[PDB]
Amino acid sequence: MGSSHHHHHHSSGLVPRGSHMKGNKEPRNVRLTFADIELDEETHEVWKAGQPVSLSPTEFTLLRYFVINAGTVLSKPKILDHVWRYDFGGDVNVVESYVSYLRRKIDTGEKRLLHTLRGVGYVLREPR
Template sequence: MNADTPCPAASVLLIEDDRKTVAYIEKFFEETPIRITTATHGTQALELAVSGTWDCIILDRRLPGMDGLTILTHLRAKNIQTPVLFLTTMDSIHDRVRGLRSGGDDYLVKPFALTELSARIKSLLRRHKLPLNTTRLVFEDVEVDLLSREVWRAGVKLYIQPQELKLLEYFMRNPFVLLSREMLLQAVWDIDFPIRTNLVETHISRLRERLGRDCSPLIHTIKGQGYMLRNQ
């Protein structure tokens, strides 16, 4: 699945108070199976989020009536596990980490490309259907057995060190999602504060070597933004 793959049928709640952004998103998805319902006020949005059945929620951080973090906190307190994608101008590392730690599933900063928004929604829908206790992950010709801690590519068993395997697992649970260096540090190394280190770069380089330089590349560098697992 890539950005050009047709969207699966889904019901999405867009919580956004900027009318131009709403119109921009609604027009893009009007010819797709994704149905967009919009809420522009925080209190109204929470009522809809709690009462409706949504496949995904797109949530702004700054809203009239109630901010996005408060809305998400209420949802998670009610054990509503609908995947939530933050869409916001708040772009600091602290903001991203706080949003994800509050129960957000992904974080996209404005301004944004609609094709990336579409890819992230599709990834969230895929991940939401994938049980957390899944013990076998597959992407293209790569297979990971999380019980035996074994990895194969094109049927060939690979030697992967523990931290590289943890990194690969995170990528495979988040295909077609732009993962920033900070997100990888937090998820794989539990580092959620600014730090000067080449941990991410070093381990991604090693992981690419393990997966085979002569094979089709799967982990792509998005210059100035981060990394993405994709098939082209």
């Protein structure tokens, strides 16, 4: 809620009286994808190589963050503070439990897209 909106920097063109003809502000809903992973922020659903998984809000946020930062080595404590940022009250052992369950619900194929750097954390990366 504000009055800003209309930016005071419209050095781009100068004929909004028409411009488009229908609208192109956005293509379609917000859907995240990765290697063989699909997430719909609209239907809050997940899909992996023809393998759908019913994850909960928390577990969903975790997977989503992993994808957003896919390629960057994440840390156990960092990941916690990042997610638990919506509900404090979870030791560092709670993450391990969730991670183990996640692996079982996300790991299965011969292609390991989740590398575990024991002592540091985990990193998302496609098989090379």
